[PDB]
């Protein structure tokens, strides 16, 4: 089995920076992952994006610092070759 763990703050702060933790298990091959803040609900616009590497060197964990500046919700998206996972996040101004 190959599983992933995505960690994020509950409500996204508009203006302030947020840390998004990605952890992967069951992988021995090194690969890249993209963590992005995208529009709700069609993902037509991307606000902030961060590419992270996952390998044996960093123990298959990484994070990206992402922010949103001036809408009720955004999408947090984590994409790679092996998985694609999105979560709807509420925002406060």
């Amino acid at each position, epitope marked *: 089995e190959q599983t992933y763990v995505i960690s994020a703050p509950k409500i996204f702060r508009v203006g302030a920076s947020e840390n998004i933790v990605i952890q992967v298990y069951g992988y*021995t*091959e*090194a*690969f*890249d*992952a*993209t963590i*992005s803040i995208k529009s709700y609900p069609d993902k037509k616009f*991307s606000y902030s*994006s961060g*590419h*992270v*590497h996952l*390998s*044996s*060197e960093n123990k298959f964990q990484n994070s990206a610092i992402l922010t949103i500046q001036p809408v009720s919700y955004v999408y947090l998206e984590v*994409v*790679s*070759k*092996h998985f*694609s996972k999105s979560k709807r996040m509420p925002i406060t101004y």
Partner: antibody
Amino acid sequence: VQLVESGGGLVQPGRSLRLSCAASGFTVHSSYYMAWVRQAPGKGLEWVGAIFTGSGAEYKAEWAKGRVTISKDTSKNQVVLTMTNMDPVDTATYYCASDAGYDYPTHAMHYWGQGTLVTVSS
Amino acid sequence: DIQMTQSPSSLSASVGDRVTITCRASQGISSSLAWYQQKPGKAPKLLIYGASETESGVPSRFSGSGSGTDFTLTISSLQPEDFATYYCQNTKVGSSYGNTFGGGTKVEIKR
């Protein structure tokens, strides 16, 4: 997806080689595993090294370590190879190659450039 | 780096033959293996990715198999366009591996 090599030709012995690879048809949403592959006349394919376009994570062959530097650019989508202290042994056709990003599950070289001939001679 | 051993180095075959080319890795790489075709004066072309998946555009006669250390490229009904040199490559990215190509297998016209 198209890959164009530039910066090949005649290199003097001892000098530093620098090759650029420009990629077309790359999406910003995905990271790409871009490699350099060389082939001497009448010989097989030799993997020099590679870089992920997203994170900038560098991977190299054990013979290439200490001599080879592979660098990246985000907006330009250009990957640059640098090889220090060139020798007649390094005379080869140098290929820029790439995977298909997150669309395909493996790091196989799906796309290949035309290749540029590098001749190391005095 | 990982070593990829190809056997044989060269083989003689006719149009319509079933051709078997083997690739052997020095350590286990699961399904992370690609097959390439190269004609003289031309850039290499991907045939098989992920050990057993044929790339779109590549004819169905080309098929890959194997997992772990031993891998096999099969061409069922050999065509005039199939005469070339064939390379296997480990595609597993990592500091302990490297994306090493095999020595190559030249498929030559038997007479």
